Symmetry: C3
Subunit: 279 residues, 3 copies
Amino acid sequence: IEEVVAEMIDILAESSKKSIEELARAADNKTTEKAVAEAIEEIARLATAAIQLIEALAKNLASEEFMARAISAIAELAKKAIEAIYRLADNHTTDTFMARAIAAIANLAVTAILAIAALASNHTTEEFMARAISAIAELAKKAIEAIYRLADNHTTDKFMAAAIEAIALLATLAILAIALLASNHTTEEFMAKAISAIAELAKKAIEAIYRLADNHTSPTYIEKAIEAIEKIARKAIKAIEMLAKNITTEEYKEKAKSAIDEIREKAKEAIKRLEDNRT
Amino acid sequence: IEEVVAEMIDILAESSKKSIEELARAADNKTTEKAVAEAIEEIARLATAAIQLIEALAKNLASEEFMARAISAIAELAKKAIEAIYRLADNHTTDTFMARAIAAIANLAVTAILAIAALASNHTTEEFMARAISAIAELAKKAIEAIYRLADNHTTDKFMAAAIEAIALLATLAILAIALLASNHTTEEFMAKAISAIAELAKKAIEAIYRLADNHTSPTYIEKAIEAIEKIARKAIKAIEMLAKNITTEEYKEKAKSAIDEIREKAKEAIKRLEDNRT
Amino acid sequence: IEEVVAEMIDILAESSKKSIEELARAADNKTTEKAVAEAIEEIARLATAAIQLIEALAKNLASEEFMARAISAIAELAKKAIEAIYRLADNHTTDTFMARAIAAIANLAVTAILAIAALASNHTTEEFMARAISAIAELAKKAIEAIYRLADNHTTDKFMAAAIEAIALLATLAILAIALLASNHTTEEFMAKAISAIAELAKKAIEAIYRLADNHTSPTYIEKAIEAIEKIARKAIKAIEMLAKNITTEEYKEKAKSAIDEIREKAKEAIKRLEDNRT
C-alpha cells in the first residue's frame, strides 16, 4: 500500500525539516564562522540525502495522488533548507563562506528540481504536472533570489561572477526541466502557464545577473555576465517556441510571442545598460 | 554473470570494512576530538557510499541467492560501522559531538534499512525475505541500543530527546519496512515471525525511551517521550493488525492479538510510571 | 527530446569542470595544507555529484550516441578531477593528507567506472560498447599512474601499502566491469579487444605495485604486495577465460591464450623480484 509508503516519505520529510530547524537554531548561538558553515553543510547534506531517499521511494508509487505528495514534500524541504541556509548566511563575514552557502543553495535547488522533473515525467494528469512545473519554477526563483541577496555582500568580482554562474544554471536547468514536462501536456491552458513560468524565470535571472554585473569593476567579468544573460534568453525562447510549435490555438501563442519579445527586450536593454557602463 | 557482480559487491564490502576499522584504529590514538568526529563522519560516508553502490549493483541481479548475500553485506557494513562509531563516541568529552555521532548512526541505519527493503521487495521466496526481516530488525535494535548506550554519559538532557526521536524513527521506519516485506508473504507462519520481530522492536524501542526519561530533569521532556512511545505503539499495532488481516487460520491470530496486547500494556506500563516520575 | 536531456547533461558536465578548475586554481596559492585538502574534498564531491546527477539522467536516453556522450562526459569529468587533484597532491608535505588524496582519486575512478558500466549495459551496438570498455580502461590506467606518482613521494611504508591497496581495487573492478561489458559482445573481433584491455590493465597495475613494493623496507608490506599482485593476475586470467568460452574462432583464442600467458609471466617476474628483495 503506497499510502503506507507515502507515510514513510512523510516521516522522512518531517524529521529532516525538524532536524534542519534545530541545527539552524543551534547555529544562531555559535561564534566561530567555520562552525556556522558546518551548520549550513549539515543542512545541505540532510536535504540532499532526504531528497535522494524520497525520490527513490517515489519511483515505487503508481498513484499520482501519492506521487504529488512526494513531490509536495520534496519541494518544501528544499525551500525550508534554502531559507535556513540564507538567514544563517547573513551572519558570514568571509566571502568564501558566503560563496559556499550560495553553492549549497544552488546544488540543493538543482538536486530538487531534477528529482521533481524525474518524478513528474511519470504523471498522466496535467493538473499534477502543472503543480510539479510550478514547484520547479518556485524553487528556481527562490534559490536565485537567495543567491542575489547574498551576492550584494561580496567585495570580490570573482565571487560575484561565481554567484552569476550559479544563477545561470538554476535558470537554464529549471527552464529545461519545465520544457520536458510541458512538452507532455495535451491541455492548452496548462501549456500557456509553463510559458508564463519560463518567462518569469528568464526575467528574474536576467535582472539578478544585471544587478550583480552592474557592481563589477573589471571588464572581463562584465563581458561574462553579458554572455550569460543572453544565453538564458535564447534558451527560454527555444523552450517557449518548441512548446508553441505543438499548440494549435493562436490566441495563447500571441501571448507566447509576446513573452518571447519581452524576454528579448529585457535582455537587450540589460546588456545595453551594462555595455554603456563599461570603459 | 551475477557471480562476477556479487564478486564486485563482496570486494566493495571488504574494502569498506578494511577502511572503516583502520580509520577507527587511527582515531583511537588521536585526541583533538575534532579529528575523531571527522573519522566518524568518514566512516559514515564509507558505509553509506558502499551501501548505495552495492544496492545499485544488486538491483541488476535476478538470482535470489546472490541478492541475499548483498542484503547480508549491507547488514554487515552497518553493524561494523555502528559498533565502530559507538566505541569512538565513548571517547568524546563534548556531548555535542556524541549527539552528532548519534545522528550519523541513525541516518546510517535508515540508509541500510531502505536499501534492504528495496532489494527484498524483489524476492518471491519467503525464506530470503525472512532473512531480510531479521536483518532489518537486527540493524534497528543494534543502532537503538548503541544510541541508548551513548545517551547515558552526556550532561544535556534535550539531546536525549534528540536521541529519543532518532530512536523513534529507527523503530518507526523499521516497522514500515518490515510491513512492506511481510505483506508479500502467502505463508501464515512467516507472517507470525514478522509480527514477533515487530513486537520485539516496539518493546525494545519503547523500553529504551522509557529508560532515558527517568534520567531527564525537566517536565516537558517526558511528555515528548510519552508522545514518542505511543506513536510507535499505535502504528506497530496497526501494522500487526493489517498483517493479521491477511491470516485465515484461527491459531496464529491469538498471538497477533497477544503481540498487540503485550505491546499496548507494556507501553502503558512504561509511560505511567514516568508519570509517577513526573512532577 | 533526448537532445534536451543531453543538453541538461552538457550543462552539468561543463559546470562541474568549471568549478573543478577554479578550485584547483585557488588551491595552488594558499598556504595551509588542510585548505588544499579541503579543496580536494570539494573536487571529489563535485566530480562525484555530477556523475550522480548525469547517470540518473542518462538512463532516460533511448539514442545510444547520446548515451556515449554521457559516458564520454563522465569519463572527462573523472580525468579532469584526478589531474587537478594530482597537481594539488604534489604540494603536500604530510603523507597523512596524501593518503586521503589517494582515497579521493581512487573513489572517483570507481564511481565513474561503475556509472559507465551501468550505462554501457544498455548499448546493443558493439561499437559503442567497445568505446565504453576503452573509456573505463583509460580511466583506470590514468588513476593508477596518478596514485603511483604520488606514492613515490611517501615516507611511510604503511601509507604506500594503502596506495598499493588503492591501485589493486581499481584494477580489479575495472577488469570485472570490462568483463561484464565484454560479455555482451557477439563479434569475436570486439571480444578480443576487451581481452587486450584487461591484459594492459593487469600489466600496468602489476607494474605499478612492483615498483612501489621495491621502495619498502619492511617485509610485512612486501608480503602484502606479492599477495596484491597475485590476486589481480588470477582475476584477470579467469576473466579472459570466461570471455574465451563464448568465442568460436580458435585464432582469437590463441591471442587470449597469449594474453593470459603474458599476464602470468609478468606476475611471476614481478613477484620473484620482490622475493629477491625480502630479508
